[PDB]
From a paper:
Within this class of proteins, the bromodomain and extraterminal domain (BET) family contains four members that are transcriptional coregulators and that recognize acetyllysines (AcKs) using a tandem pair of highly homologous bromodomains (BDs). Despite heavy academic and industry investment in this area, the generation of paralog-selective inhibitors has proved elusive because of the extremely high sequence similarity between the bromodomains of family members (90 to 95% within the acetyllysine-binding pocket residues). Using the highly conserved BET BDs as a model system, we conducted three mRNA display-based RaPID (random nonstandard peptides integrated discovery) screens using a single library (which contains >1012 unique members). Crystal structures of 13 distinct peptide–bromodomain complexes revealed highly diverse structures and binding modes among the cyclic peptide ligands.
To assess the contributions made by each AcK to BD binding, we synthesized peptides in which each of these three residues was mutated in turn to Ala. Mutation of AcK7 reduced the affinity of 3.1B for all three [name] domains by fourfold to ∼2 to 5 nM, whereas mutation of AcK5 to Ala reduced binding ∼80-fold (KD 29 to 35 nM). Mutation of AcK12 to Ala resulted in a complete loss of binding to any [name] domain under our assay conditions, indicating that this more canonical AcK–pocket interaction provides the largest contribution to binding.
Residue numbers in the entry:
A (entry chain A): 42 to 168
B (entry chain C): 1 to 14
C (entry chain B): 60 to 164
The structure:
């Protein structure tokens, strides 16, 4: 009936860092996925209330969306690119585990992930 | 609707 | 002793509480789940229920044997289900949390 609090976007205990890879994950990778036509259901955290999905947060316990990833990158939340990529994987994985293969939301997530993999292939060398 | 290992829930599609 | 009790009260209890743990907490009931070809393919079944019963009943000789049963459970899921399947992704989340706990043995 209610949505849980969103994932954190900053943490004083977590060491902050800004690298050219993390800059590329914000300026190139995330910007490309964000501007995509299939991006609108992945921009904010999954609103189980408006979608009439009482079971979504009974199944998914580690939610993730691109808005959370966007704030974390802007707040230098990640120490390296792997941690940021791991949130992307969590966002896609959650969608594949909760929904059926062939659903609209899964076809949409599969298209975003393919473009995501296209940019990750050319992630710059850490300088 | 989706079923995994006995547990069943509503997907976004329904 | 210290390594076998750590796998019972820390490793097994952490994975048991995980969100994607319910398919792996008990042996696969292929008759109930309507999987007639499961035990034709999986010749070494393993689950968290039996691993729990082996730790609290002194069945292992060292921590390495307990890691084998965990890998056997993960393998039997990666063998029977297609890569990228929902159930496979759920098993990869458990294994990642498993390799993080074993790394701090
Ligand atoms: N739905």
């Amino acid at each position: 009936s209610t949505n849980p609090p969103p994932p954190e976007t900053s943490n004083p205990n977590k060491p902050k860092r800004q690298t050219n890879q993390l800059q590329y994950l914000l300026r190139v990778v995330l910007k490309t996925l964000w501007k995509h036509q299939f991006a609108w259901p992945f921009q904010q955290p999954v609103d189980a209330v408006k979608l009439n999905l009482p079971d979504y947060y009974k199944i998914i316990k580690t939610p993730m969306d691109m808005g959370t990833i966007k704030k974390r990158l802007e707040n230098n939340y990640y120490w390296n690119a792997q941690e940021c990529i791991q949130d992307f994987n969590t966002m896609f994985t959650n969608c594949y585990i909760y929904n059926k293969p062939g659903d609209d939301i899964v076809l949409m997530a599969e298209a975003l992930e393919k473009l995501f993999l296209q940019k990750i292939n050319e992630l710059p060398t850490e300088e | 609707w989706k079923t995994i290992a006995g547990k069943t829930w509503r997907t976004k599609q329904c």
